[PDB]
């Protein structure tokens, strides 16, 4: 007997209700809410992942302190001089003897700046030019050369040479840092015998260790809802495995892969049906006999 009406907008709905036999207003109202901005979730997500990066850098330094204190090299970490040049000790310890405290300085500075690992487009051209330079030296030699030639070391900065101008950058791959750290640790192993091979495997695990993009955050006893160690007690294998969609008619079943026998025989059947003997004949022919193709199927 009554008629409802709604005017839907971006941040408002106007609403009314009438009777239509008399035509008097039974109710009218205006409901106002703020808009659904997607810029705030982008801000929140960006800040969360930046906080994770800062956390994991500090945890690498903490793990290095624990490794250096457990193996008994240095007792306390308050008398360490912060006014020594780390690149000079990093290039010196490749052939000479580091005095047990400059070794900690060199390894801490090396674990503070590791490298990129997606490589294994101007930015690509600059990092390939830098790789074309590092094929004969370690990156510590490159950084010390830039330091004692131009004064600057860090950032991205341009230098005018005698006849040309090139912009320099501080980006090296992780393999070069790992090779340099392995060389320094083998030379100091030849000098100082407290650095066993398990120290070198633990330090290289701290240096080149990264997570996988399908793992996420968390640990076995850390229980994150953003990572594979779910907070319900279980453990996923790949976190994009619970995001795969449902079926179209039974909304509780996982989908199938497109690249198996089942979906492919279903697709050939759906293109063939718009009888049974030559259905099976064409299907076993395409299944078992090779050098196949669409023009070959029409032939």
């Amino acid at each position: 007997d009554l008629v409802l009406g709604l005017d839907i907008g971006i941040g408002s709905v106007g609403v009314g209700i009438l009777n239509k036999v008399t035509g008097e207003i039974i109710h009218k109202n205006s409901r106002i809410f703020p808009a659904a901005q997607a810029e705030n979730n982008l801000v929140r997500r960006t800040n969360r992942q930046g906080r994770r990066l800062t956390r994991r850098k500090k945890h690498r330094r903490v793990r290095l302190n624990r490794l250096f204190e457990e193996s008994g090299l240095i007792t306390d970490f308050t008398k360490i001089s912060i006014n020594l040049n780390p690149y000079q000790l990093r290039v010196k310890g490749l052939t000479d003897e580091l005095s047990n405290e400059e070794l900690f300085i060199a390894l801490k500075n090396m674990v503070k700046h590791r490298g990129i690992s997606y490589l294994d487009g101007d930015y690509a051209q600059i990092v390939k030019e830098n790789s074309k330079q590092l094929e004969t030296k370690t990156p510590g030699q490159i950084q010390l050369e830039r330091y004692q030639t131009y004064g600057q070391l860090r950032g991205d900065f341009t230098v005018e040479k005698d006849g040309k101008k090139h912009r320099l950058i501080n980006v090296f791959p992780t393999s070069a840092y790992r090779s340099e750290a392995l060389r320094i640790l083998q030379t100091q192993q030849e000098f100082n015998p407290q650095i066993t091979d398990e120290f070198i495997n633990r330090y290289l695990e701290i240096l080149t260790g990264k997570r996988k993009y399908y793992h996420g955050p968390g640990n076995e006893k850390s229980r994150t809802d953003y990572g594979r160690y779910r907070t319900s007690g279980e453990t996923l294998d790949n976190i994009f495995g619970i995001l795969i969609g449902k079926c179209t008619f039974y909304p509780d079943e996982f989908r199938a892969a497109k690249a198996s026998y089942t979906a492919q025989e279903f697709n050939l059947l759906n293109d063939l049906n718009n009888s049974k003997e030559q259905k099976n004949q064409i299907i076993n022919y395409v299944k078992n006999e090779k050098a196949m193709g669409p023009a070959k199927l029409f032939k």
């Binding site: 609403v15 109710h27 009218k28 109202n29 205006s30 409901r31 106002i32 809410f33 703020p34």
Partner: protein, 300 residues
Amino acid sequence: DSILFSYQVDSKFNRKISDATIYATRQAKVGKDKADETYVLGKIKDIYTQDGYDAFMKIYKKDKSKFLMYRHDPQTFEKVIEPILENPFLKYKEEHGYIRKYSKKGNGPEIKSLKYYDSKLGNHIDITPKDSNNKVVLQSVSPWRADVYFNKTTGKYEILGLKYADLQFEKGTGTYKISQEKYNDIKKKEGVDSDSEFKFTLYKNDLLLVKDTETKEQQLFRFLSRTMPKQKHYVELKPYDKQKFEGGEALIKVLGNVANSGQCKKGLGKSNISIYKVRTDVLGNQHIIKNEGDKPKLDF
């Protein structure tokens, strides 16, 4: 004009507490100074671009003593204003190179940036490190809600203000709340007496009702925030029908008229006034309250 409105309330508690930018202050004498004062510093990021020269000449045509090099290295500033006489910094760069400082020889450092005394210190959070010498702050501190108190021995209202950064993760169990002693400090600063009765608390887009005592008038507002934190009880309000208060529009007798900008920054800490809170339905049925509970909600 018998239409009813219905707004949505904003009562979330953990939002952006401040900027993440770390500022620097100095104590100096700038302008009309009879004592030292704390000044937030600034920086021209690079002077050879188009923006850095414009910012430099803006500061220069405002006041010359704002630059820190003007007070700590004067002859280098003389060799900075010899180029600006005859041309600018980009032309000096494309002929002679980087603008080095004053020295005996050509071996001083280059000049790419310049700091100055930007502004005076307002709302902040003191995040000064342990072994530091000047103050270090965080700016842009936002407000969250208001608690309205009322005492009988004066017969007028007093108004608190809580920010997002007044709450904390606590030290034994990790809960998000504010203590009672810090709340007593916030009550003391805003001028609330100890023996006042807590009436209610106001969030943003919460419907306020102002009634008078001598001439029986009624006005209805939306609350926004707790502006002007130098003198007390000032509240920023917004209309109920529209989104703005443009003009010198009159509201009721005892409040006055809106300013020339369009902002309604009133002082509700006065006698001859009365406040209710309106809690609407989603269809607009205004229900009026006078007492919320016994104590303000402090644990979340």
